[PDB]
């Protein structure tokens, strides 16, 4: 069945209920917690061009939702609004009882389009999508989440928004853009820290290199910098 | 048994956010109409490493993932809220006889 852990003299053991560990007494339901842990801990890459290869679309499978009771503080939280090319939404809207993931350093708000061949968005490595005290296995539209998994236990006795754009989302040929405003932006490259981008919008709002027209604006970056 | 980590990297420090598990009803804060918003009902804390509880803990999480997925495929509920109660009943049944 579903495995389970136990704390004993500050040492984590598999809670063997198959061979009962009678020495560890379970006295109250307060002694049970259900904790969620982020994939930032394991060391997976966190930038968006490394992220959206782990995601993918599928139809014909129902979604599921399980709750937990505490989670890690996170360093990266994501958000999506992806439209099908005929103008409809790829992602289903969030049913009620869903709030965003509540403690986040940065929010990688990502919009744009893609082919969207399927109904839902699943995680290719079978991880969860951590919402507010509710791990799910799909992505709801417009609700800020984080990635990670859930461990079970037996116990002893603010943010900052970064906006992107994307074209051809999901495939291996998806292009990525920054956003300064709704007309001015700059193409992304892999060697870019987000602090570089923070200096970039501050530089652009200082030097005024924005849209003074009605069209869209795509900078690139100095290839030797 | 003690679980051995298998992951390449592992953060040996948590930073926990959780609900205020119990709280003294200081005057009128407990009433929802005077209550704080959703962003303010939490508490946080650290957890210094105590002989690898954290890396063993994350390895435990990765070991639980497969069985939890196979459990969630098996149900028809949208929002499974009763895993802990079921496992407490498992504990009491196995210890009772």
């Amino acid at each position, epitope marked *: 069945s579903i495995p389970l852990g136990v704390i004993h003299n500050s040492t984590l053991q598999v809670s063997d209920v198959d061979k009962l560990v009678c020495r560890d007494k379970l006295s109250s339901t307060n002694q049970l917690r259900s904790v969620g842990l982020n994939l930032e801990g394991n060391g997976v890459a966190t930038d968006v061009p490394s992220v959206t290869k782990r995601w993918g679309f599928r139809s014909g499978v129902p979604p599921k939702v399980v709750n937990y009771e505490a989670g890690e503080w996170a360093e990266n939280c994501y958000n999506l609004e992806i439209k099908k090319p005929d103008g409809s939404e790829c992602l289903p809207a969030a049913p009620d009882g869903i709030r965003g993931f509540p403690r986040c350093r940065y929010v990688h708000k990502v919009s744009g389009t893609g082919p969207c061949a399927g109904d839902f968005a699943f995680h290719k490595e079978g991880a969860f999508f951590l919402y507010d005290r509710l791990a799910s296995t799909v992505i709801y539209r417009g609700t800020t989440f984080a990635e990670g998994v859930v461990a079970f236990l037996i116990l002893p006795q603010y943010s900052t928004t970064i906006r992107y754009q994307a074209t051809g989302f999901g495939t291996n040929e998806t292009e990525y853009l920054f956003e300064v405003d709704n007309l001015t932006y700059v193409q992304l490259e892999s060697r870019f820290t987000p602090q570089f981008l923070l200096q970039l919008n501050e530089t652009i709002y200082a030097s005024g290199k924005r849209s003074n027209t009605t069209g869209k604006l795509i900078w690139k970056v100095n290839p030797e910098i | 048994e003690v679980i051995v980590n298998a992951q390449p990297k592992c953060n040996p420090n948590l930073h926990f956010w959780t609900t205020q598990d119990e709280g003294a009803a200081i005057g009128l804060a407990w009433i929802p109409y005077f209550g704080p918003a959703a962003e303010g009902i939490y508490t946080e804390g650290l957890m210094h*490493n105590q002989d690898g509880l954290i890396c063993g803990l994350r390895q435990l999480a990765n070991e639980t993932t497969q069985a939890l997925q196979l459990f969630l495929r098996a149900t028809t509920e949208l929002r499974t809220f009763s895993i802990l109660n079921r496992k407490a009943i498992d504990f009491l049944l196995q210890r009772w006889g």
Partner: antibody
């Protein structure tokens, strides 16, 4: 571009309390590990301790009896206090940011960014 | 507890060569949580490679380092005169930082 500014008295007085201050410019304290580092001139580096913005704190066992560390999120400041100082404590002092990672960049608890550092002397 | 012993005490090598600085842990570690610094004189130390193989940003690619058990190296191919400093071995583990003395590296 985050900047850290050390500050404190250059001159001391033995068996007194020596206060210092690291002041954050460009980011927030909230969520990271903030360090203190002793460097006697010509010697190696001696690590002092770290406080995290929750207020939990850990110490070097060589200076466990002697010092104490506090932080202020309101004035965005990081403070060091050394109780009952002596002339051996004359050194160059540092503050450094030991997070696991900022957004995309793994640091693996390295110290990324540093203040300029102050030479502080305990004498009569 | 943990004592970082560097070897050798100094280096003096020619440009274009390959300098290999290693440090030995006093104990068994098996926890790849390390850091190599460059202290320019009159300057704060600056990170080069953290996590025993991971290059810091801003670092030109001619730096490398590795190691598994207790001996842990730092390797600079194609030596440049701008690398003239003293380099530092660092271990984090069990909620504590620890350091070593360091090694003065000299470019000829």
């Amino acid at each position: 571009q985050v900047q850290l500014q050390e500050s404190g008295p250059g001159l001391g007085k033995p068996s007194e309390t020596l206060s210092l201050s690291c002041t954050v410019s460009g980011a927030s304290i909230r969520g990271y590990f903030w360090n203190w580092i002793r460097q006697p001139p010509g010697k190696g580096l001696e690590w002092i301790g770290y406080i995290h913005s929750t207020g939990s704190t850990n110490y070097n066992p060589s200076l466990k009896s002697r010092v104490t560390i506090s932080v202020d999120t309101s004035k965005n400041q990081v403070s060091l206090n050394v109780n009952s100082v002596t002339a051996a404590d004359t050194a160059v002092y540092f503050c450094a940011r030991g997070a696991w990672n900022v957004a995309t960049v793994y640091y693996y608890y390295g110290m990324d960014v540093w203040g300029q550092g102050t030479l502080v002397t305990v004498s009569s | 507890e943990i004592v970082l012993t560097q070897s050798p005490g100094t280096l003096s090598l020619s440009p274009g060569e390959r300098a290999t600085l290693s440090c030995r842990a006093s104990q068994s570690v098996s926890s790849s949580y390390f850091a190599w610094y460059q202290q320019k004189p009159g300057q704060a130390p600056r990170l080069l490679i953290s996590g025993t193989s991971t290059r810091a940003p801003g670092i030109p690619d001619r730096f490398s380092g590795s190691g598994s058990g207790t001996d842990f190296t730092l390797t600079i191919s194609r030596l440049e005169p701008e690398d003239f400093a003293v380099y530092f071995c660092q271990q984090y583990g069990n909620s504590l930082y620890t350091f070593g003395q360091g090694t003065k590296l000299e470019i000829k």
